[PDB]
């Protein structure tokens, strides 16, 4: 209220002590627990923690990978937390050599069950799947307890070193010959409405385009064949209901200079990846386009 207190400078949070420090200091005792510096206090990255069975956590022990929950009409295990690579197993976009590579590592009773639940129901994938963000730490227990982030950067505790985002080469997709200073990274599930297969194409779009109309124009321009396949399935097969030939959502934005080619190793199996070092997640809902 006073002009001294109003024009007083704002208080540094790192200079003032914790509530526990002043609480212990008031009654003046001592505990064996060191309390004077609380960890994770200066953490803008709001995180969450997820239990998941052992059969899905391979190629995840290295930090930095997507995580997607699904829905299944069965009641008790109803939501599986599938990694992006097990999602890419199902996708028709990936090369068959890499497909037989990363299927050979994911031989588990939970992974094949998730693969059956992907293609069992009548729903398409975009009405079924739901992102969570990228993962930063593992637990590697008998069941695994991963730590994903909803918003913010990807870093180790104490912020000693930043965590990168990994994506396989086949899901990587750019639409410009040179990049801007900033570029967003998206998710694309495009639907081939073909007779024999309905397996989609999975992509990430490291593009410098933020506006949705100027993004969806280039999205239609690069995926004209898929919309032509959609309208061909519309005219050839009557009384069918096709919808959302491609879907699009925002995943984050990168530094546009640390993007480089590295590789993941799990059980001496190389898997080449595009790696984005200083990256912050930024989630959004599944918009669609036809």
């Amino acid at each position: 209220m006073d002009a001294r207190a109003v024009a007083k400078r704002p208080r540094d949070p790192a200079d003032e002590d914790n509530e526990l420090v002043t609480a212990l200091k008031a009654k003046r005792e001592v505990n064996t627990i060191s309390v004077r510096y609380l960890y994770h206090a200066d953490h803008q990255a709001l995180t969450a923690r997820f239990f998941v069975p052992e059969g899905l956590v391979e190629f995840e022990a290295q930090p930095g990978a997507l995580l997607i929950r699904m829905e299944t009409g069965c009641d008790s295990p109803r939501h599986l937390y599938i990694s992006l690579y097990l999602l890419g197993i199902r996708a028709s976009n990936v090369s068959a050599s890499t497909r037989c590579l990363l299927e050979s590592v994911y031989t588990a009773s939970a992974a094949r069950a998730a693969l059956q639940w992907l293609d069992l129901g009548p729903h398409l994938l975009h009405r079924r799947l739901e992102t969570l963000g990228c993962v930063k730490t593992v637990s590697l227990g008998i069941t695994s307890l991963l730590t994903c982030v909803m918003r913010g950067y990807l870093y180790n505790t104490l912020k000693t070193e930043v965590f990168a985002l990994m994506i396989p080469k086949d899901m990587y997709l750019t639409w410009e010959e040179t990049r801007g200073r900033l570029q967003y990274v998206y998710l694309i599930i495009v639907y081939d409405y073909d007779g024999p297969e309905t397996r989609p194409g999975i992509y990430v779009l490291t593009s410098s385009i933020a506006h949705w109309q100027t993004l969806v124009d280039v999205a239609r321009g690069k995926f004209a064949r898929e919309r032509c396949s959609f309208v061909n399935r519309r005219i050839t097969r009557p009384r069918q209901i096709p919808l959302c030939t491609g879907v699009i959502q925002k995943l984050g934005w990168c530094l546009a200079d640390d993007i480089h080619t590295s590789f993941l190793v799990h059980k001496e199996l190389k898997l080449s990846v595009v790696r984005l070092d200083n990256f912050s997640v930024e989630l959004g809902d599944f918009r669609e386009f036809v």
Partner: protein, 151 residues
């Protein structure tokens, strides 16, 4: 060290039973027509918009532009409300009829159950009945919209 909040008051008298009923809704969502600072109790929720002739669609149209808030604390002096902001986490009550899971996209809906009910008997004053909007997962909201439109 205080935070920017909204001081809502009540012109009716409040029983200790009604205060104990109100303190059950700590992390409850409340829509507010305009984020003032000293608001009365007449603009908490949707009882300003309960109409005999109007329906669900105008309630959804108003709720698209309402200023949603959260409660902080209840006192015999006054009531504390908190406006949320983007990119921060908050505790929020599941007053909706459907349980949730982790990572589910949630959105706010006008109440389907209307008027007097065994669940709508919350903070009911003389001319006032505090009503709260539902917090439903997103695909159930889409299903409710489609089914209500086709009905």
């Amino acid at each position: 060290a205080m935070e920017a909040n909204i001081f809502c008051t009540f012109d009716h008298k409040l029983s200790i039973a009604d205060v104990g009923k109100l303190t059950k809704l700590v992390a409850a969502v409340v829509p507010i027509p305009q984020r003032l600072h000293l608001i009365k109790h007449y603009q908490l929720g949707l009882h300003q918009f309960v109409d005999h002739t109007r329906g669900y669609v105008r309630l959804r149209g108003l709720l698209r532009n309402m200023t949603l808030t959260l409660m902080r604390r209840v006192e015999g002096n006054q009531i504390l409300l908190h406006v949320p902001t983007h990119g921060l986490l908050y505790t929020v009550l599941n007053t909706g009829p459907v349980t949730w899971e982790k990572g589910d996209a949630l959105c706010v809906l006008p109440p389907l159950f209307h008027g007097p009910l065994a669940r709508e008997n919350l903070l009911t004053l003389g001319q006032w009945e505090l009503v709260l909007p539902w917090i439903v997962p997103m695909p159930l909201a889409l299903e409710i919209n489609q089914r209500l439109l086709i009905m």
